Amino acid sequence: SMEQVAMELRLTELTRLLRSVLDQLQDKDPARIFAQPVSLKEVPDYLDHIKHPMDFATMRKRLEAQGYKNLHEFEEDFDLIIDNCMKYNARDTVFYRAAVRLRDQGGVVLRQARREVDSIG
Ligand code: NA
């Protein structure tokens, strides 16, 4: 159907917007602390602590399979990266501080993306 294609063009455009957002968020992590999943070989107990791991590479795989239906789903995944880190790592750690900074800096980007998604539909 013709609707299904129109829908697929918007999902495709949403993916386009979300890719740009993902790149901007990832730039706020120059240390690359959140780039890849936490290693289960190096942190073997991690899943005892954190039930839903997340990282920027895993978000990118979902993004490119058009696995994000709306900005809400995408923000959920971004929030997981931050919130998981802030639970597993103590307050006085380079990792916890890096999450706080990603959260603060990412807020500005997410703020405008929500407006863009509402504006362009
Ligand atoms: Na903690």
Do residues 81 and 32 touch, judged by C-beta distance below 8 A? no
The ranges assigned to domains in the chain are: 1-121
Sequence-ordered alpha helix ranges (H) in 28-88: 46-49, 56-64, 71-88
- How far, in Å, is the centroid of ligand 1 from the Cα of 107? 22
- How far, in Å, is the centroid of ligand 1 from the Cα of 21? 28
- How far, in Å, is the centroid of ligand 1 from the Cα of 49? 10
- How far, in Å, is the centroid of ligand 1 from the Cα of 94? 13
- How far, in Å, is the centroid of ligand 1 from the Cα of 27? 25
Tokens of 13: 């455009």
**What's this structure's resolution in Å?**
1.7
Whole-angstrom Cα distance, residue 1 to residue 67? 21
- How far, in Å, is the centroid of ligand 1 from the Cα of 66? 33
Do residues 63 and 25 touch, judged by C-beta distance below 8 A? no
Other Cβ atoms within 10 Å of 15 Cβ, number = 18
The CA-based angle 33-42-23, given to 5 degrees, is 25
The correct answer on CATH 1.10.1040.10 for the domain covering 1-121 is no
Whole-angstrom Cα distance, residue 80 to residue 70? 16
Q: State whether the Cα torsion 41-42-44-47 is positive or negative.
A: negative
- How far, in Å, is the centroid of ligand 1 from the Cα of 84? 9
Q: By what method was this entry solved?
A: X-ray
- How far, in Å, is the centroid of ligand 1 from the Cα of 43? 15
63 contact partners, CB below 8 Å, separation of at least 6: 15, 18, 19, 22, 74
Do residues 96 and 86 touch, judged by C-beta distance below 8 A? yes
Do residues 50 and 87 touch, judged by C-beta distance below 8 A? yes
Other Cβ atoms within 10 Å of 34 Cβ, number = 25
- How far, in Å, is the centroid of ligand 1 from the Cα of 88? 5
